[PDB]
């Protein structure tokens, strides 16, 4: 009966390809793997082959993800109920996959006819190649191997492409799902959990396959999100539902972060590197020719203080003969113009030679070197008036901190938006779920960035005019200030306090929308409320008792029963039942005469929901404000609708996407309830804003009654304060950029260029100028640029070369055309590798054009005509810090960049040089290096955010093995 | 049509299509789909831009009922007029309610 | 059986099995323990479905 499948991932095993299905460092069994395993079981039951068995899957539900270990095997048991057409895949007795599987009795080829695209594709020549597609997917968290890299070509929108057929159904349908999720605006690891239907007809799949000039069979795939289908070959996946699986915090990327700082302490051959034509390189090769007399090689640069021969020496030491030549730099890096300027023809050179140090740098009278120190692990805390509460590590209440908000670095002023100082912010159930990790941030409607914190849905405080207001926000309510439309604000009455009013908006808006707008509750209607002692429960009780409705409330303890009795004296002893059990249903049906309750405001889950459905009377209204059964697609027997029953799915969040007159109805209802005294503030347990973590855990334990409120600011005694400015508090520094400023990324069309541009967009950048020599070539670049442009960002792709001073001037002018230049990023790079022997001065010139001369010109033009510049960042390499074989010119250019940044920072202007190691998932090293793994790009962006708020001139980020 | 609404009528014949077109000139060629198969769903999902319909007056059953449910937009109203699926207690996936959908028996 | 308290849930009877005067009716009971479900069939035709 139960077909056993011992999935083994060994090399000799036939299922070794499953090793290539990696999702965030874990080998997961694909959902299409379950589809194929059930297909095999059904073919065996019917005595057919999979290639001869057109099959239909329906209501496929994935209940857990199977971990395929590196060593060992996993047994999956498939059981078929042929009479009910159902199947069941289980692992070690635990249900894994459920659904209906049945042979397609009448396979219709017309089903696998690709739907017409909603709009024609204009960028037909520019498509996403296989490498680009899977680099993007790896950025999203799918570390797919070659076996599952079946997408050879895909359109920019992700609505069409071609899938490579390797005679493997698992890989084919997995790449089908990859194509479906490729054009997904949501970011993160999205794994399928439900599929409505999957029709596989191998007969027409063979016909649909066609072969390219590579002699590889491919199938055209079309993803129609309008129809919510994916059609490829003879596979049709309709109603695919994917949920965002959180990425495990057990990431091996624990980067080493360091600071690069100046630290005071035969026949000699002098090599002057001060020449700008690099003609000395050949002479340096001559120095490498000798062996005995080459021991005292003194490589000195005395003209330019930003020579940057540090990386040159560090890399040349790694090359053969460098240690024997003892190549050591004598760099006169005087940060200030008023400097001693030690003469290298005096006794100072003799003392330096006697010391025989590996490096000698003269810094304002200090004879030292450049050294790496461990960066302090303490996050940079700054005093700001605009901060929000965020969980630094998801699912950990201990890592709850105040971090700087986007409002302080970017102050917006426009009609229809109001910046309100927050004195009190009420923690909600969704906030606890977000902080504890039980709720995915992507589940909340709205365009939220990856680094966005959505804690807080409710606040009270003072608006810009100083009026005492209380507001309902989609997210970010746990902030010292919020930016919300005035349509979501209510005036706090004089008799109320800000602490009292902080509990009203979310709870009473939810109750009013459920009961009046949706439930249409009439006076005198018997009504059941689940979790009556809770906020929404209490508001529903107040609204129902305002209408004189008989109320049955479910509570979880005797203390909550007593509190509800005291708070609402209209409730008798027969109005209370148990919410932790199902018995409430009997109670209700005993006290309503078996008729039922006209309305059921239900926030309970699983069978407690179904019992609440059983409590419904004829013409009953079931308002489901809970989410567990809604998110799980749990079955609901529709025979209840034989009672003329209405079933409302009440979500208040849908009011933050349109905010039309439908929300204005709820706003008017809440205002009328406030005026009439129906809306009464709940009991508030107040925790000081300096300690939000204890509030979070206290409300998580669930013994709280009413509302839990964090006091961001104590309410001063007054009616309308003219100032109403938030008080200064210490918060973790976070990099944000004004929307009115333009930012330049040199080489922003490159890999790290595009990723940093996206990160800046997520940090509030609205004006971007990415400069590249060749313009837009690859499909990935075009897709990213057009996505940012559709997002509303002013992205300019310029061809101005920062190598030439005129080019840098034109680039800065183009940026200033968009807006004042707030930041310049130097990521432009050309690589001319090779040992010192097979190295030419022209290669040095080419490698230093973007980095050395480019940073010269950027610094000069920013000094001349960028008074308001906030960021001057350049990307150097750890090859400068320590040394790389065959990359002497790269190290020299990086060291020159670092010297430029150090001089800029010493003078007072912004300056930052980031010594990046191997860069993962994106870059040049992807299109173990020097003992360092490629740092994943998310970690790179986190480290860059850390570095951008540091006072150190040069910092390095690299991951050891 | 009195309320000036966009209407998608599912009929199972071409003669029914012609009679509906003659009776209600406000209906266009895109207003008609097929009631004898699930296909109408796609038709609706094509002509609503994937948004779906605000109200479903469903008298069909089984897979046609499920397809009609899948046609609901956000804040959609599903008015069950038929009784087969109601009488048989057929399970209804409780995830359409995540679109602020109200189900009317 | 007498040592096993049991719970049936959502039991549905799709058709009635007529026991012949002479002969025998074969009833197939299949259990999905992980799904906690059961199925009773007569000749491959679904007769009873539910959870147990
Ligand atoms: N659909 C929508 O738009 C909205 C939905 N909601 C949902 O409505 C539900 C109720 O809202 P709300 O009253 O504010 O939630 P609350 O924390 O205020 O209380 C909800 C009830 O959940 C019960 N509960 C049981 N165990 C726990 C626990 N471990 N932690 C916390 N509570 C527990 C408690 O009641 P008891 O012990 O007596 O059973 C608690 O009173 C929430 O789940 C919330 O997510 C809220 C706002 C809007
Ligand atoms: N990726 C990595 O592993 C590491 C990267 N870094 C730093 O990361 C930064 C980004 O490099 P990378 O990740 O490799 O991205 P890419 O190397 O893929 O992109 C390099 C970009 O440099 C552009 N470029 C070079 N010179 C100029 C110029 N004079 N004007 C305009 N554009 C220019 C090139 O433009 P065009 O399109 O015309 O070629 C190219 O697009 C570099 O500064 C690099 O030093 C540091 C250490 C490691
Ligand atoms: N719940 C309630 O309150 C009420 C419900 N109803 C329900 O409305 C539904 C339809 O009622 P109503 O529209 O008046 O019926 P009609 O006789 O006027 O036609 C019903 C439609 O159903 C289709 N149909 C499918 N099979 C048949 C069949 N064997 N004979 C005739 N027509 C068929 C036809 O459309 P097509 O063939 O093109 O598919 C037909 O046009 C019924 O299920 C009925 O139970 C009616 C009154 C009240």
Author numbering:
A (entry chain E): 858 to 1122, 1410 to 2071, 2079 to 2112
B (entry chain F): 1689 to 1793
C (entry chain F): 907 to 958
What did the published study say regarding this structure?
The engineered protein enables electron cryo-microscopy (cryoEM) structure determination of the core modifying region of hFASN to 2.7 Å resolution. The isolated modifying region of hFASN produced via the TEV cleavage method demonstrated adequate orientation distribution to enable 3-dimensional reconstruction of a cryoEM map of the complex into which an atomic model for the core modifying region was built. CryoEM analysis of the modifying region revealed an arch shaped homodimer composed of two of each of the DH, ΨME, ΨKR, ER, and KR domains while lacking density for the C-terminal ACP & TE domains. No cryoEM densities were observed in the 3D reconstruction that could be assigned to the ACP and TE domains, consistent with the inherent flexibility of these domains relative to the core. Many residues within the ΨME and ΨKR domains lacked defined side chain densities, although backbone density was clearly defined. This observation suggested the presence of significant conformational dynamics within the two pseudo domains at the periphery of the hFASN core modifying region. Our structure of the human core modifying region aligns well with that of porcine FASN (78% sequence identity) with a backbone RMSD of 1 Å, indicating its structural integrity in isolation. Surprisingly, close examination of the human DH domain revealed a close-ended catalytic cavity as opposed to the porcine homolog where DH domain has an open-ended cavity. This is due to the presence of a leucine residue (i.e., L1097) instead of an alanine at the back end of the catalytic cavity in the human protein.
